[PDB]
Design a protein around this ligand. Structure first.
Ligand code: ATP
Ligand code: ADP
Lengths: 529, 209
């Protein structure tokens, strides 16, 4: 029996068929022919993928499929103990029942299943060099000895689960041990449809769901959800429906049958979608409000030019086959407002996976920690069919200070390497950097790794400043005329953020003396590049 | 039989296509054991980890009757940066020791390198180890540019004539990867203005050899 859907797993069509064909084809065929052939049974498999995509469930279902005994779930981090010969003892306790039962019953024993969770936290590559042996060089030896040793066990099956499939030893993956590998990835549209059917079958059966709920619509709405996210969405929707029912019953003396009629749920789904669930591999709507705080006000043509160039770059990266990786760099004088435009372009991208990496979250971090954080961000970005990543300041990640000069080399190497690595086949990426000192970057030879550059100028004419004041709308008509007459000359040089700060500072005086303070502050500032 | 270990360095201007040619040579070798040691799988490693990784690859390479190992983008392994200068000494010493170590009796080996900064390697006294060097050039004439455009197969006959009339009047200097990127960037405009934008980008990028 296979019936992948009946068992309670949706979206796993091929990653189940291949497993069944390769590994379990010698357990169900008539024993006579198997014995005549003389082929042994596979001794384990490996499962790796993003967390929360349904691995442990598949392991338990496989265990239940073969009439095996109760699996022995083990957690990787929990086996380590600080005395000598305690971790090995724990690793050696799991294989007792199999040995005893084989020794007693001969060749008619049952099947035992052992599930290792986070197998990469105890089994790491062993150190070859003398005097450079690792601290956990005995746990691996014990495990290797037990899995396949001098005395054969022919009634066992080991299933290992992990997320980092490249840190595991290379003597643990040869055709004798854990010889099958499978990848469980984020489900696509059809998988989400199947999962939603599985998780709403009960409500459909009990006749509580409305007639206006469409599962296909909600399948399309969620773009990079995993299974846990969908189940949480369903539960949250039902809970808010219950809350609404109770509120309606308590607020009014309406008949209880009317409340039960309202027990059907339509708006709960959308409300929970927009206010309850926060995907990990999806766009986040809480950050743009924290970066583009005062919005984008069109004060001149340069804004339109920059936005048009960004749109062209996005349209290129969407519909290309010879260039899956694209980079761009926004550079200009200080306080010109680069991060705001970068975030605006990212928000208008309309890509499933959008993330921003800024140094505000790495205060006090040593260089290696920053390397690890950047690596994790890019690793997450590599798991979606489309992506977009923003590096906020490429001059504070390096710890650059004009004296010296002094900076960190390792982070620079990480950056230089990560701007050339293409994603796995068929997937696409886009990188937008933002900097204020392009000459030093050119000195470091980083400006040649990028693809194109964009310039963000400052206000340089009187009429532009007057239009900016109009859009902001702070001063009245008479003060407007006074200022316009005073600075009709087109020799201004100011940044938008500095303009906001100057307006705020000047507004604090009495109504009579307000223009004079602003004019004095403007004059005190620079007046040319 | 008197030369069981060989070496070669492929070097040239940036965006010229060295790694692809090295991989093509290795593939056409028809050797039982072929490997690549690239720097993009050691992101964040310290010096000793890089040393151990290189040593492990070469140790495996020493257990087959034939072999071929590719070390590409050397200047990334050494961790070079013009300000300073700064780089790693342990990795350089390990590489210099490994470039002239013979395998066990009767076995053979071949190493191919890649780089874009030949002078800086010359200053470190490294070109005394590599047996020979090969040079990969860029596009350096209008005829070759038109031939490449034809073989890629992007523009029509009328556009070919229009671009030729103007581009055959002088010489050019451009890499192949940059050419692909320029073509892809140009193809995003409306059908009327494609060639004009392509010519503008080519004019802007053009630099003295
Ligand atoms: N056209 C505009 N372009 C940019 N920012 C604008 C514009 N109109 C209004 N703003 C506001 O200006 C502020 C932009 O400041 P921002 O944080 O982007 O500065 P910055 O250039 O990154 O600064 P610094 O380089 O000193 O770190 C935000 O409040 C944004 O809302
Ligand atoms: N393919 C799937 N179909 C239906 N539900 C799923 C699927 N994958 C995961 N789930 C849901 O996710 C929950 C937890 O999954 P879990 O076993 O924790 O995965 P992981 O091994 O990544 O921790 C399950 O209770 C299940 O309801």
């Amino acid at each position: 029996d296979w019936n992948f859907e009946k068992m309670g797993i949706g979206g796993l069509d091929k990653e189940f068929s291949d497993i069944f064909r390769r590994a379990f084809a010698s357990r169900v065929f008539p024993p006579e022919i198997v014995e005549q052939m003389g082929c042994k049974h596979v001794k384990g498999i490996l499962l790796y993928g993003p967390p929360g995509c349904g691995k442990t469930l598949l392991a338990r279902q496989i265990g239940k499929m073969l009439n095996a005994r109760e699996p022995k779930v083990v957690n990787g981090p929990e086996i380590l103990n600080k005395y000598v010969g305690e971790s090995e003892a724990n690793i050696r306790k799991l294989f007792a029942d199999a040995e005893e039962e084989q020794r007693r019953l001969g060749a008619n024993s049952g099947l035992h299943i052992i599930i290792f969770d986070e197998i990469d936290a105890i089994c790491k590559q062993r150190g070859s060099m003398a005097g450079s042996t690792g601290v956990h060089d005995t746990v691996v030896n014990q495990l290797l000895s037990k899995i396949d040793g001098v005395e054969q066990l022919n009634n066992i099956l080991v299933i290992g689960m992990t997320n980092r499939p490249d840190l595991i030893d290379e003597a643990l993956l040869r055709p004798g041990r854990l010889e099958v590998k499978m990848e469980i990835g984020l489900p696509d549209e059809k998988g989400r449809l199947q999962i939603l059917h599985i998780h709403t079958a009960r409500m459909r059966g009990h006749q509580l769901l409305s007639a206006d709920v469409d599962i296909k619509e909600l399948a399309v709405e969620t773009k990079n959800f995993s299974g846990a996210e969908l189940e949480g969405l369903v539960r949250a929707a039902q809970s808010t429906a219950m809350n609404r029912h109770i509120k309606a019953s308590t607020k009014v003396e309406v008949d209880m049958e009317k409340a039960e009629s309202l027990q059907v749920t339509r708006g709960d789904f959308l409300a929970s979608l927009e206010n309850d669930i926060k995907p990990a591999f999806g766009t986040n709507q809480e950050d743009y409000a924290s970066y583009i705080m005062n919005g984008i006000i069109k004060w001149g043509d340069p804004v339109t030019r920059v936005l048009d160039d960004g749109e062209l770059l996005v349209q290129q990266t969407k519909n290309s086959d010879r260039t899956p990786l694209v980079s761009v760099l926004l550079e200009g004088p200080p306080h010109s407002g680069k991060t705001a435009l970068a975030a605006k372009i990212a928000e208008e991208s309309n890509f499933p996976f959008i993330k921003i990496c800024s140094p505000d979250k790495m205060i006090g971090f040593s260089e290696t920690a920053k390397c690890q954080a950047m690596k994790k961000i890019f690793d997450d970005a590599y798991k979606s069919q489309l992506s977009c990543v923003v590096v906020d300041d490429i001059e504070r990640l390096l710890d650059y200070v004009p004296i010296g000069p002094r900076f960190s080399n390792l982070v620079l190497q990480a950056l230089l390497v990560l701007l050339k690595k293409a994603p796995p086949q068929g997937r696409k990426l886009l990188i937008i950097g933002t900097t204020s000192r392009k000459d030093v970057l050119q000195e470091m030879e980083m400006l040649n790794a990028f693809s194109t550059t964009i310039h963000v100028p400052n206000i340089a004419t009187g009429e532009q400043l007057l239009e900016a004041l109009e859009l902001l709308g702070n001063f009245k008509d008479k003060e407007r005329t006074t200022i316009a007459q005073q600075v009709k000359g087109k020799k201004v040089w100011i940044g938008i953020k500095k303009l906001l700060m100057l307006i705020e500072m000047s507004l604090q005086m009495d109504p009579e003396y307000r223009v004079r303070k602003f004019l004095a502050l403007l004059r005190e500032e620079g007046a040319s590049p």
